[PDB]
Design a binder for this molecule. Structure first.
Ligand SMILES: O=C1Cc2cc(Nc3ncncc3Cl)ccc2N1
Ligand SMILES: O=C1Cc2cc(Nc3ncncc3Cl)ccc2N1
Ligand SMILES: [Cl-]
Ligand SMILES: [Cl-]
Lengths: 124, 4, 124, 4
């Protein structure tokens, strides 16, 4: 087509979605991790994670307001990834990289899994 | 704004 | 902080939100324009438009599944803007610029209003 | 990935 494009649009949209998350506006699901609860928007979770995409496209699960993750999932690793989903920023540190990579593999967040693999390989 |  | 950032994350999120819109997945509102209906996600509309932000933060309207726009609003202008919300791409043409600007002013989409004003000024 |  002959469209024009606003460079900062996608970033501004994500920033506003994160402001709605902060203020608990229109959040429609609770993600339960080892008895730690995280409120979010199903559409943002689906847009970021192959696991959430599969969960909320399921005809029965699409209607659930609570999702319980596998007990092996670390709440801090999940929190870091949820922040990444809403900001594009990943708080990757020596002390959390293993939990973050394991959580990203479970959530099916391929780009996160990729940078974790590379950061681990650099330290070996 | 840009030409994409 | 000491975060790393994935450059394409915001764009990939918006692309996936538009794929959900295309497939009518988790859309939670119908926008009615001069008897033309558009299905969308409330959170994306709020992230893009000051009008939708005000509508869906209202304690009564946040729960509506149908929103009727002012009868002066042109369905094509709305359609072009809804596409822009989900893609960052604006199909601005000599034949639609007046309807698009009028719709962007009503929806409170300041960056769109700005490029319409500039494109109109260049033709005078 | 970048340093923002
Ligand atoms: O690594 C990843 C990130 C990711 C996101 C999604 N999401 C969607 N894919 C396609 N159409 C719509 C949506 Cl919402 C699916 C798989 C994966 N895998
Ligand atoms: O031009 C525009 C675009 C736009 C978007 C919104 N959205 C939000 N603002 C702040 N926190 C959350 C959200 Cl969702 C408000 C006003 C305007 N005005
Ligand atoms: Cl990812
Ligand atoms: Cl705008």
């Amino acid at each position: 087509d002959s469209c024009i494009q606003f460079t900062r649009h996608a970033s501004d949209v994500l920033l506003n979605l994160n402001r709605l998350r902060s203020r608990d506006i229109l959040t429609d699901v609770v993600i339960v991790v080892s008895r730690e609860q995280f409120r979010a928007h199903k559409t943002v979770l689906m847009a970021c994670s192959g696991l959430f995409y599969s969960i909320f496209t399921d005809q029965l699960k699409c209607n659930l307001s609570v999702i319980n993750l596998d007990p092996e999932i670390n709440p801090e690793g999940f929190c870091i990834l949820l922040d990444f989903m809403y900001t594009s920023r990943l708080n990757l540190r020596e002390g959390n990289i293993m939990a973050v990579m394991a959580t990203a593999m479970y959530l099916q967040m391929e780009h996160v899994v990729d940078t974790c693999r590379k950061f681990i390989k650099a330290s070996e | 704004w840009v030409i994409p």
